[PDB]
Design a binder for this molecule. Structure first.
Ligand SMILES: CCCCCCCCCCCCCCCCCCCCCCC(=O)O
Length: 133
């Protein structure tokens, strides 16, 4: 179900990430470093448990979850959120909730590339990842 998402992915295009970070209240200095960072995202599976690592020269994160089961998460920008990840239309949809706010992180495969769409408020960011061998 999730199997074409699995592997190591490198950031190759970003659009509107500053908009997205600013909407979340990320400070200018962090937005500045993040705008020049190219993370590696690693998505692994062990049975029903997915682990999603995001590695960079600035911030690292790691989450583990079962699809369709809520989990606590502390994001790269230090939000403490209630999260759930599911497959929807073949897309991996990650919803974060905190303080009555929501953001979605939607991953879809298009021509072998991993497109991550990040929405908060009115801000919509599109970031493109290519697989590493
Ligand atoms: C989960 C990403 C964090 C690990 C590497 C981060 C590189 C820059 C963006 C994300 C975190 C650091 C800067 C603060 C903004 C974080 C906003 C939420 C997470 C965005 C993840 C973006 C991505 O996975 O490409």
């Amino acid at each position: 179900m999730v199997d074409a998402f699995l592997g190591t992915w490198k950031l190759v295009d970003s659009k509107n990430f500053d908009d997205y970070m600013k909407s979340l209240g990320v400070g200018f200095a962090t937005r500045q470093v993040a705008s020049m960072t190219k993370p590696t995202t690693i998505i692994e599976k062990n049975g029903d448990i997915l682990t999603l690592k995001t590695h960079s020269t600035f911030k690292n994160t790691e989450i583990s979850f079962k699809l369709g089961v809520e989990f606590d998460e502390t994001t790269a920008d230090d939000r403490k959120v209630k999260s759930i990840v599911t497959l929807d239309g073949g897309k991996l949809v990650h919803l974060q909730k905190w303080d009555g706010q929501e953001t979605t992180l939607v991953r879809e495969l298009i021509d072998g590339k991993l497109i991550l769409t990040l929405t908060h408020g009115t801000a919509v960011c599109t970031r493109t990842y290519e697989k590493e061998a």
